[PDB]
Structure formats: C-alpha cells, structure tokens
Design a protein around this nucleic acid. Structure first.
Ligand code: TTP
Ligand code: CA
Ligand code: CA
Ligand code: CA
Ligand code: CL
Ligand code: NA
Ligand code: NA
Ligand code: NA
Ligand code: NA
Length: 893
DNA sequence: GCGGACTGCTTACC
C-alpha cells in the first residue's frame, strides 16, 4: 500500500516521524531535514520559483532547520521578506508525501482512556497529583480490548478484586450492567501497589503507544494527572516515557511529542453544533445515546471504598460511552480525513487557519510557487451580512429560500484570492447597485460592490481549493438528505406495521430507497422497522457530521481572510465577500417581489417579509389565495402545490435575476444558486397561525417540507426563541415549545388551555428542570469578601451565595471558573442571604444545602421571569392572548 | 422610587 504518516514533530535539527510503511508496519525515523526558504531575486535570474504575484525567487537550501530560522531573523533585521513555509514539519510532510494520502485507519492506534482518582479533600489538581491513581481503563483500537488497571491497595482503603461475573449481571441482579458486547474484550489486571500499577501501565504504553489519544477531558485532567503522578513518584525521566521520543513540554497542559491528542470534549464542542447546559460525560451520553445516568449511593469520594465493584465497572463504562458517542458522531474519522487531506498534524484540525495554510501551501507548491511571509497586522472591525427588520406579526403561509454555500460561492463567482486582485473602481452607494442604477463597475474584470476588481481568466488558489472541499461537502449532504428522506418513509410505515417475525432489510441508507425496497418496507414488522429507522437516523448523523464540518471548514476560509493571524489576511477580500453578499440578498429580494407581483397580478406588495445573510422568507398567503384555499383536498395538497410553484416558477425567475446580477458585476461564473428551503403553514381547516416573527433572528414556523424532505408529521422550525437557548430551564423550553406548537397548529384557545394548566401544576416540576443555566466567567472579578462587587452579574451572585453556603466543607463540589452553573432564585428572607444561588451544572446540588434550597426556591419569580415574559413576547407578536381577557360578557352567568 | 439609557454578559443566527 501507499505509505502514510502517523505523527510528526520537530526537535532541534531533527524531524521525528512515526509512519506506516509500504508493508503496513508502523515505524519511526529521525530525519535531519534540510528545509528550503526563498528570497526575491532579480528578473534577469533564471529560476523555476515565483511568488504568487509572479515575482522570481531563488531557493536557499539550509544545512539544518536552525540555520533556516536564523536566516529568517537576519532577513527581518535587514528588512526583506523571507518567503516559504516556515513551519518546517508541514514542509517535511509535503516533501515526504507528495501525493493524495490514502490511509488505513485500522493501522492507526487510537487509544481511549480514563482514570480514577479518589480524593478526600476536593477535586484532585493535576498539577499537584497528590492522590493515588486507583484505576485506569485504556481501550486500544488495534487490539479492540479494554485494558483495566485496578489498584487493590491504597492509603484510602484496601478492596477486593473487581468481578467480571458481577459486572455483567443486570442492575436488578445487583450487577453493574456492563454491556455484554464488551465483556469478552476486557483484560483485567489487579495490583497490590500503585507504583507497580503505574510501572506496568508505562510498560504497556511503550508496547502499545497511542497515535491518536482521546477520552473525556483527557487533555485537562487524565494526561496531566498521569504525567505528574508518575513524575512525582519515579522522576521526570520516567514520566517522559509517555512520549515515544522522550520529549514533553509543560492549571497546566502537557504536550506529548509524537502523540496526537484529540480530547473528545474539544472535538464535541467544535464539531457537534450543540451548546449544552453541562459537559459531564454522564450528561452528554444521555443526550447522545439515550442511556440512563450511572447511579450509585453516596459521594464519588467514597464510591471506591463502599462499592469498588461498581467503581471499576463505571470506569470501564465511561471509556465505552466515548467510543459509542464516536461511533455515532464519527469525529475521529472526520479529524483523520481533514488532517490527511491538509497534510497537517492530526491535532491541527482544531485550527482552520493552520489547516488552510497547509492546504494552500501544498497547492501552490505543486506549481513551484512560493508562499508569502506571514505579516503582523492590527485587529480591525469590518462589515458583515445584512439582516432585514421584520414586521412583528403572525404569518400563515411561508416559503423560504436559501443560497447554497453562500460565502464560498461568492469567492468562486467573483474569483476572490490574494493573487487575483486586479485593481479598484469608484463605488456608488450600495443601494444603487441593488436597484441596478449604478454604472457597471467594469467590462473587463470581475467585481464586488465594495470596489474590488479581480482577474476573471486566472485561476485563484483560494477559489480552486475551496471548490475541492465544497465538492466533498455536497456529496456528503446528499447522503444525509437521502438518509433523512428514507427516515420519513420508515416513519410512515410505522402507521401500518405487520404482525410477523422478520428482519430489517439490508440497504444503503445513503441512497433513496428503490420501489422494490419501499414495497418490502410496507410489509415489515414494527421491530424491524424501528431497527431500520435507527440505522437510517444513524446514517443521517454520519452524513451530517461529514457535511456540516466541511461547510464549517470552507466558511472558516472566508473567516480566515478576516483573521490577522492568517497568511492571506486581507480586509479587501473579506469585505468584497460580505458586501457582495449584502448586495446579492437585497438584489434578489427586489427580483422576488417584482416577479410575484407580476404573476399575482398585483403591484407594490411586499412578499419578502424577512431575510438574513442569504435567505428570504416569502409570504405565500396571496399565492394560496389566488388559487383559493377551498380547492385543496388536504394539507399535503397545498404543500405539493407550493413545492411545485417554487420549483417550476420561482426558482427559474430567481436564477434569471442572479444571472443578470452576475453580468452586472462581470463575474467569472454564475454560482448564486438559491433553492427553496421550507414550506410552512397551519394544518388545513385548523385555527393554527402557521408562523410568527418577533424580530430579527427570532421566529417560529410550522414546516411540512424542508429541502425536499416531506415530513410524516409537521416539524417546528424555531430560531432564536427561548426554546432554543441552553440558558432556558429544561421544563420551560418544553412548555414554551408546546405553547408555540399549539399557536401554530391549533390556535389561541388551545394555547390558553395549556397555559392555565401549566401555571397550576408547575410548582411540582423537579428543581433541576426549572433551573436556569449560565456560564461562570470571572467569578473572582466580582468577589468582594465573599459578596457581590459592583455590576455583579445575576448568575455570579448565585455562585457567591453558594460559596458562602458551603464554606468550611472541604468535600462540597466547587464551582469551576469558566464552566456552567444551574441558577435558581430564592424567596425573600431565605437563610442564604441573597436572591439567588448557583451550583455546578449537570449535578444535583450538594446534600449539605439541598433541602433548604428546595424550600426557598422562588417559584413565582421562576414562572414570571423565565416562562411568562417570553410567552408574552411570542403572543403579542403573533397578535393573540395566552390568557382570556375581560369583557362585558363577564356580567352574565 | 423608578424609567430610560447605557453597559457587561450571555447565547443565539448567519
Ligand atoms: C453558519 C455560518 C455561516 N457563515 C456565513 C457564510 C455562509 O455561507 C453564510 C450563510 O450561512 P448558511 O446559509 O447557514 O450556510 P451556507 O449558505 O454557507 O451553507 P448552506 O448550503 O447549508 O446554506 O453565512 C459563517 O461565516 N460562519 C458560519 O458558521
Ligand atoms: Ca507487589
Ligand atoms: Ca445558505
Ligand atoms: Ca405494513
Ligand atoms: Cl451542497
Ligand atoms: Na474518571
Ligand atoms: Na436495568
Ligand atoms: Na511535582
Ligand atoms: Na438548501
């Protein structure tokens, strides 16, 4: 097979590389790499090297990497540009792997681990590592085995061996319910001393050295704890065995040279597109996998002592949970894909700037072109997208339209790149271009309304490389949408399931079901169908991960143009994109309004009610009215009608409008592709209002079709409202959403019934479910003798109240700076001495003060502040009442 | 005694 790297590092004048060879074997080599950099040279000098602007350069070979970096400094002292890739390991990878890397993931050692540390005096600080490590579970992807290291003898208690027989038993049998599919994969090792455990773990590590190292919070806890514990016990030289090159670099984070650490919490935060109230593994596992919380009696600091059996079982389970989350989300696969595509260290996938620098560098190197030197720039603001101010109101029938990959398509259309800049023109006010009254900027170059002109013959490296990734994105989105469409087919077949014993069909959910498959589905059992729906949704999530993160990468290339740390930073190019974007949106709003007035036979009516960046929301009341609501059989009938109308009439008109804009700006290629997104409206013959807007970025719609996916049941599309915010209490989100569902689908009366019921019963809701959530930043900034300082935020005040309440209890959970907290208001005269209290999110509040918090919660404040105020906002906007008003009719019986 | 204007903070939407 073709060779591929695993890890690369620079240590002095040496490049240390771990790699898989042509026979599939892992090897390590130290290479005294000789890098090249470039300097501008006279035009009369024969060379094959040119910078991106076409100026000739000469290549300077250096005896070692130190001589190259010293030359860079000297060139700085002279005042001349030192060109070329200054990150020598990226240069090394590019030289060593001068082809498209095809890798075999089964050859890559991915290690998932988690440690346990009993601490009687609070959270065990990794920098101190003063407590024994009493458990390590380490899963190896190559062995497919869970290696379990169990400390039997500790100063905090001597325990019996963990029993795999009991671990496998059901909870109802007094077992631990360790999943049956990993029982035979567990390799259990008890130890009588901590030193012997750690020594063996190091020997194990040497034999099975991770390439990718992951787990939950491994970078901030597990890795530094293990490193510091081993260092404190055996000495630094022994601790350095954690690095395959014996080099490490040190609240601290340890860099293990020759290992690529991908902490799963960081992968999840970057790639999941969620914002969670808590990031405990417990919480995320429940959210992602729908598994129950790992229950136990007493505190964690005594779990090993009281129930060591469960203690070890939960350690193993914790490792497995991350594997299960990755099997669903596939962020490891994404990191490997992106990393090898860019030819970077795998951990550099967290940095889109490093990623794009490497992609562009490799692309330019292929043509013997030389990259410019990074330069220092001051941070400056620059304008972004346009957002229309909507008239707050209900909106019955709505169709939306969105542009495909907007900013990257602008880049490709206008041909925006550092080296395709051609000149400038004199700008007219933006609305002059929008209304097509300003003179055509250029009949030679491709232009943006910010004043920039670009060559339209030349291939730009930014357009070229963004197109390649965009093409990957488009493929994966197709798989995602098909899996989604396949999902609805299965959901509708769950309305008439057969009573028989069969099996789920063997199909590729990435492609639309054939008629044969669909026929078989209608005769399938409920058990088989539910299993198919599961596999369909899993296939959809896999596609979603792949497509939405390639979308993120290409949008981050736009973003990088506005980042001073980017080698190709240029506010001329960044603004060219956003300004063109503002023009395109407002241009097509006009075209859409014009076309719809023409087909509806009216004049001057506003059809576009809202728009943000690249989307428009079209009021379709008059389209429905022209055909008359009476002529429709059911809801699905008018949905098909609007689907057809948008597809056969509106979209061709939109394409005509954009083609004209492309000619207006003399652009290189028409790539403004705006298709229908959502069809929204109330159920036919209902009192539902269909949708409403309260303001910019705040609306709700009752959607029947989304991007070609015809829902089995109508799905609420809610943006910006409190239902969508992690800060809103769980039970309030749920209640507010039901309020919205009733408004959009059923009407005012239905809303009023539900509200009355909620108000009556809400005090019985669990305290966690009605707690607000907030991030805890700068606690110390507002701490004045344990009391709130000037301008102390509400949630920070709650934390200070908590701290005073648990003062003198070394066992009580501490609020961690930067993490999230649950927040509850307190009734007047409470023993806590303040109007609110906060505690670490994702946890029960400590038993020390739990009963008193429950007693003093302010349900009245909770209701009117988190529930009623947002509800008042929704309903006044939609022009209705959540509560029956007083009338002259009240004087009757 | 507190409404309005302004500020910091948080978390959305694109
Ligand atoms: C979501 C997002 C958008 N944007 C900008 C660039 C996007 O092209 C533009 C439009 O937002 P989107 O319409 O949400 O994203 P998109 O048009 O790029 O991709 P899609 O085909 O799924 O619609 O907003 C960012 O800069 N960063 C982001 O994270
Ligand atoms: Ca021993
Ligand atoms: Ca879009
Ligand atoms: Ca059937
Ligand atoms: Cl796409
Ligand atoms: Na742990
Ligand atoms: Na059970
Ligand atoms: Na130490
Ligand atoms: Na779309």
């Amino acid at each position: 097979m073709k060779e591929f790297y695993l890890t690369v590092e620079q240590i002095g004048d040496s490049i240390f590389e771990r790699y898989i060879d042509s026979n599939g074997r892992e090897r390590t080599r130290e290479v005294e790499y000789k890098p090249s950099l470039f300097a501008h040279c006279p035009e009369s000098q024969a060379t094959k090297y040119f910078d991106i602007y076409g100026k000739p350069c000469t290549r300077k070979l250096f005896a070692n990497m130190r001589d190259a970096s010293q030359w860079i400094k000297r060139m700085e002292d002279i005042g001349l540009e030192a060109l070329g890739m200054d990150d020598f390991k990226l240069a090394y990878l590019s030289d060593t792997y001068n082809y498209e890397i095809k890798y075999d993931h089964t050859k890559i050692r991915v290690a998932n681990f988690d440690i346990e540390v009993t601490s009687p005096d609070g959270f065990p600080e990794p920098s101190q590592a003063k407590h024994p490590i009493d458990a390590i579970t380490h899963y190896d992807s190559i062995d497919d085995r869970f290696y379990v290291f169990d400390l039997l003898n500790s100063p905090y208690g001597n325990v019996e061996e963990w029993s795999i027989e009991i671990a496998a038993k059901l909870q109802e049998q007094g077992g631990d319910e360790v999943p049956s599919e990993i029982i035979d994969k567990i390799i259990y090792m008890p130890f009588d001393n901590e030193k012997e455990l750690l020594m063996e773990y190091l020997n194990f590590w040497q034999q099975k050295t991770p390439v990718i190292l992951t787990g939950w919070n491994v970078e901030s806890f597990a890795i530094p704890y293990v490193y510091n514990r081993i260092k404190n016990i055996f000495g630094e030289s022994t601790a350095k065995r954690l690095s395959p090159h014996r080099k490490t670099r040190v609240r601290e984070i340890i860099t293990l040279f020759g290992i690529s650490v991908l902490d799963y919490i960081d992968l999840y935060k970057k790639f999941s597109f969620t914002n969670q109230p808590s990031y405990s593994l417990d919480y995320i596992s429940e959210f992602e996998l729908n598994v129950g919380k790992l229950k136990y009696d007493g505190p964690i600091s005594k779990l090993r002592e009281s129930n060591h059996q469960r203690y070890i079982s939960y350690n193993i389970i914790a490792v497995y949970r991350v594997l299960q989350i990755d099997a669903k989300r596939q962020f490891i696969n994404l990191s490997l894909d992106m990393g090898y595509y860019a030819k970077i260290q795998i951990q550099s996938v967290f940095s889109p700037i490093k990623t794009w620098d490497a992609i562009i560098f490799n692309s330019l190197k292929e043509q013997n072109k030389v990259i410019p030197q990074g330069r220092s720039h001051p941070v400056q603001p620059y304008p972004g997208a346009f957002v229309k101010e909507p008239i707050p109101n209900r909106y019955k029938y709505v169709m939306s339209f969105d542009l495909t990959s907007f900013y990257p398509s602008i880049i490709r259309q206008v041909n925006i790149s550092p080296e395709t800049i051609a000149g400038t023109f004199k700008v007219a006010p933006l609305h002059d271009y929008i209304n097509a009254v300003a003179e055509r900027p250029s009949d030679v170059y491709s232009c943006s309304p910010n004043g920039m002109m670009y060559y339209k013959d030349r291939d730009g490296v930014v357009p070229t490389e963004i197109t390649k990734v965009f093409n990957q994105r488009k493929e994966h989105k197709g798989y995602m949408l098909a899996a989604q469409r396949n999902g609805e087919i299965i959901k509708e077949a769950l309305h008439n399931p057969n009573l028989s014993v069969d099996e789920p069909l063997d199909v590729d959910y990435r492609f639309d079901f054939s008629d044969e498959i669909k026929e078989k589905i209608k005769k399938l059992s409920a058990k088989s169908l539910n299993e198919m729906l599961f596999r369909a949704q899993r296939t959809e999530v896999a596609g979603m991960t792949a497509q939405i993160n390639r979308k993120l990468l290409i949008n981050s290339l736009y973003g990088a143009l506005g980042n001073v740390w980017f080698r190709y930073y240029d506010l001329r190019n960044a603004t060219a994109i956003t300004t063109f974007g503002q023009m395109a949106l407002q241009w097509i709003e006009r075209k859409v309004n014009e076309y719809l007035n023409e087909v509806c036979g009216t004049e001057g009516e506003a059809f576009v009610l809202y728009g943000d960046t690249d989307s428009i929301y079209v009021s379709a009341d008059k389209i429905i009215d022209k055909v008359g609501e009476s002529k429709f059989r059911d809801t699905n009938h008018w949905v098909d009608f609007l689907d057809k109308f948008a597809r056969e009439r509106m979209e061709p008109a939109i394409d005509r409008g954009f083609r004209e804009m492309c000619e207006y700006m003399n652009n290189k290629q028409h790539l403004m592709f705006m298709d229908r997104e959502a069809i929204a409206g109330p159920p036919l013959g209902s009192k539902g209002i269909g949708g409403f807007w309260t303001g910019k970025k705040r609306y709700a719609l009752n959607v029947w079709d989304m991007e070609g996916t015809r829902y089995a049941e109508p799905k609420l599309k809610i943006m910006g409202l409190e239902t969508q915010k992690s800060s809103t209490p769980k039970a309030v989100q749920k209640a507010l959403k039901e309020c919205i569902r009733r408004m959009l689908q059923e009407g005012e009366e239905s809303l009023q019934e539900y509200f009355k019921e909620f108000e009556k019963e809400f005090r019985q809701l669990n305290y966690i479910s009605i707690a607000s959530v907030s991030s805890a930043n700068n606690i110390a900034k507002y701490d004045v003798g344990g009391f709130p300082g000037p301008k102390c935020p509400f949630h920070i005040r709650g934390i200070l109240t908590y701290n005073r309440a648990i003062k003198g209890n070394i066992d009580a959970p501490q609020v961690v700076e930067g993490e999230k907290v649950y927040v509850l208001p307190l009734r007047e005269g409470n023993p806590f001495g303040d109007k609110c209290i906060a505690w670490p999110s994702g946890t029960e509040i400590t038993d020390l003060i739990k009963d008193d918090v429950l007693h003093w919660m302010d349900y009245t404040v909770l209701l009117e502040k988190t529930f009623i105020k947002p509800l008042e906002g929704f309903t006044s906007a939609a022009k209705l009442d959540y509560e029956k008003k007083a009338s002259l009719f009240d004087m009757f019986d």
